């Protein structure tokens, strides 16, 4: 059966890491306009390692959505103070899923948003991250249980390439479970373009 979205966005089952990120009190949601998106495959221990990019986003005057493994209490507190005071507008959420699928989906988001997953495994350092490594989207909406990325700015051809890769994986899948999970990633990408 045919659908009808056109602006649903790419959504995943992770909500805000702090209630203080909420900026739509009537709905209990976080709505960020024209945000930068930081993606990392690790836990954020101290905010200091993120100061360069954080300072850069502040100067740019755009909000920042942080998608990482988790944010330590101390670092989260720092993000909260800064955003409450209006120094830098931010919201943080955990990366979708787990294990290898989490890595794949983090990449899906990076491709959709024109961002780069900051991973030490490939020689990257959060402290060395710059604005070009960040993804972007028209808007992000976060609530207690989910995150929605609307209109990722990624290259059309790159997004198509990622979708093509998944289609091949579906053909190579050896179980319905794996195929359905792969198809779900296609639907997520399709909702974000």
Curated annotation (Swiss-Prot):
Entry comment, domain topic: Each subunit is composed of an apical domain that binds non-folded proteins and GroES, an intermediate domain and an equatorial domain that binds ATP and is involved in inter-ring interactions. Forms a large central channel that appears to traverse the entire length of the cylinder with no obstruction. The central channel of GroEL functions as two cavities, one in each ring, that are separated from each other by the crystallographically disordered 23-amino-acid C-terminal segments of the seven subunits. The entry and exit of polypeptide seem to be restricted to the apical end of each ring.
Descriptive protein name: Chaperonin GroEL
Record keywords: Acetylation, ATP-binding, Chaperone, Cytoplasm, Isomerase, Nucleotide-binding
Subunit structure: Forms a cylinder of 14 subunits composed of two heptameric rings stacked back-to-back. Interacts with the co-chaperonin GroES. Can form asymmetrical complexes, composed of one GroEL and one GroES, and symmetrical complexes, formed between one GroEL and two GroES oligomers. The asymmetrical complex is the functional unit. It was suggested that the symmetric heterooligomer may represent a transient intermediate in the chaperonin protein folding cycle.
Role summary: Together with its co-chaperonin GroES, plays an essential role in assisting protein folding. The GroEL-GroES system forms a nano-cage that allows encapsulation of the non-native substrate proteins and provides a physical environment optimized to promote and accelerate protein folding, probably by preventing aggregation and by entropically destabilizing folding intermediates. Also plays a role in coupling between replication of the F plasmid and cell division of the cell.
Gene: groEL
Organism (species): Escherichia coli (strain K12)
Transmembrane segments: none
Location of this chain's protein in the cell: Cytoplasm
GO terms, molecular function: ATP binding; ATP hydrolysis activity; ATP-dependent protein folding chaperone; identical protein binding; isomerase activity; magnesium ion binding; unfolded protein binding
Residues bearing the modification N6-succinyllysine: 94, 138
Post-translational modification, as annotated: Phosphorylated reversibly during heat shock.
């Amino acid at each position: 059966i045919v659908l009808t979205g056109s602006a649903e966005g790419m959504q995943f089952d992770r909500g805000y890491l702090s209630p203080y990120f909420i900026n739509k009190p009537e709905t209990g949601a976080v709505e960020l306009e024209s945000p930068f998106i930081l993606l990392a495959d690790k836990k954020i221990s101290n905010i200091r390692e993120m100061l360069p990019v954080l300072e850069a986003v502040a100067k740019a005057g755009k909000p920042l959505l942080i998608i990482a493994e988790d944010v330590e209490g101390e670092a989260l507190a720092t993000l909260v103070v800064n955003t409450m005071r209006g120094i830098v507008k931010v919201a943080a959420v955990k990366a979708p899923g787990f294990g290898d699928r989490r890595k794949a989906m983090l990449q899906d988001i990076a491709t959709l948003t024109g961002g780069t997953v900051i991973s030490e495994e490939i020689g990257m350092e959060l402290e060395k991250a710059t604005l070009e490594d960040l993804g972007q989207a028209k808007r992000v909406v976060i609530n207690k249980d989910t995150t929605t990325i609307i209109d990722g700015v990624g290259e059309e051809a790159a997004i198509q390439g990622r979708v093509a890769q998944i289609r091949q994986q579906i053909e190579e899948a050896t179980s319905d479970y794996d195929r359905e999970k792969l198809q779900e990633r296609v639907a997520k990408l399709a909702g974000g373009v």
